[PDB]
Structure 1
């Protein structure tokens, strides 16, 4: 919901509507139907129609939508689509650089916004962005930010620089009282070992999950985020409950126990 951990948010282009149910069947916590960078300019109207048809034909489906930003002439149409279909439970706003951009998207759609930091200018304004009314949680465009800062993506030095963006997302999350952020996409679909390392690092620094681009990435993300059997056995008992193994059942312990349950996908 607007406060649980999202372990995985899987992109699927609106140009491939047959892949939308496949994305939903992958077990990803959230599916993001993309109308933005994965859809060539000449196919945006067709893509929007494809998404409309999916939502009308599958009313129980729940998805996020990555819309075109305000500079694009289809921004209003994208927002209207988000506004008019109950199945759209939030939208990703790319290239976010101001609080105003967020508010416009949140009010026009009436839906929660996930600002995606993709530039240095967005990072510099993250304080105001994160504090904007309508923001659910933050994420960032790892590749896009690397390009904006002329980094050699994948290098240790680039990761050190991206660490600043990560720190900012984590700090602003806490300051603004947002839901757990998502780490950026790990693009090497064939490198399962590398994905696991990326997930471990994100988890260890307080991210709830990762943005992802192929159904095959879901299993390893979920596996790496999963707490131990012992932590879950304890967490479940603490959730129900009070003295549970010694400590009291206070907000810090429920927040702890309930965070374990959400990392295991046993929230709500």
Structure 2
């Protein structure tokens, strides 16, 4: 699939057809139109039709869709919508607990699957799931695993438990060679100072971006994701001293060996001019 970084994946429910155009103008790397836990049961059918009309009327629009899982009766109608419009470039599979769930949603949709880890069962099967055919990258339901594991969302201890799940998304991402994963949603819409901290914590940990819920969150996320002038100046000074060809040296009073030089070069290239 696409092995590129998604810095922002903005959720917008299909009950809000007028806010899907707003989502795409946010500047979000991806927009997720939702048909599942933001859409009330009675509106799922009408919400699916709202999305179909949006894709039809907007052929150049390319979106991701969080479908309902196989336990739901609308599953197949959700998969058919993902398969039949070119604007659907992938789907979020919620409540994923098996590689077989990934393969069925992938084959029936013909589109790449972003498995969402939202439960204890998901974590335990995550080897299978990340390695399953059709997987592009992983994302995580932070508020969902707090329910499933009985966490007091927002607390020190809760973030420590979530740190273990994040570790598994990050570990399995490398083992299965997936594209960079996206950390969960920061629900305090207007708290940009808290949002900035959750974004920098995620990047420092190896995540590529964040699942967003508001367009106001897009610029804070993308701005916090770019390397600082310092980090780029460090990477430059580290790359400059490894041109000589020395095996090991010191840059900021810190030893620099091959792996550190490799970190500076990947920073210099992933974000700016390489070489």
State TM-score, norm by structure 2.
0.86
Shift of 1:35: 0.4
Separation in 1, partners of 2:54, 2:269: 28
Shift of 1:2: 1.1
238-247 or 207-216: which moved more? 238-247
Shift of 1:228: 2.9
Write the deviation string for residues 14-34 of structure 1: whole angstroms up to 9, x where unpaired: 011110010000000000000
The 3-state SS of whatever aligns with 2:255 is: coil
Q: 1:155 to 1:232 in 2, by over 3 A?
A: same
Separation in 2, partners of 1:85, 1:261: 38
Shift of 1:246: 19
Shift of 1:191: 1.4
How large is the Cα RMSD of the aligned pairs?
4.0
Separation in 2, partners of 1:256, 1:64: 32
The 3-state SS of whatever aligns with 2:250 is: coil
Q: 1:250 to 1:161 in 2, by over 3 A?
A: closer
Separation in 2, partners of 1:243, 1:86: 52
The 3-state SS of whatever aligns with 2:132 is: coil
In structure 1, the gaps of 5 or more residues are none
Number of residues paired by the alignment?
Answer: 268
In structure 2, the gaps of 5 or more residues are 241-247
Matched-pair contact (CA < 8 Å) for 1:92–1:114: yes
- 1:123-202 matches, cutoff 5 A: 123-202=123-202
Write the deviation string for residues 170-225 of structure 1: whole angstroms up to 9, x where unpaired: 00000000000000001111211111110011000000000010000111111110
State TM-score, norm by structure 1.
0.88
Write the deviation string for residues 73-129 of structure 1: whole angstroms up to 9, x where unpaired: 000000000000001000000000000000000000010000000000100000000
Q: 1:263 to 1:12 in 2, by over 3 A?
A: farther
The 3-state SS of whatever aligns with 1:89 is: strand
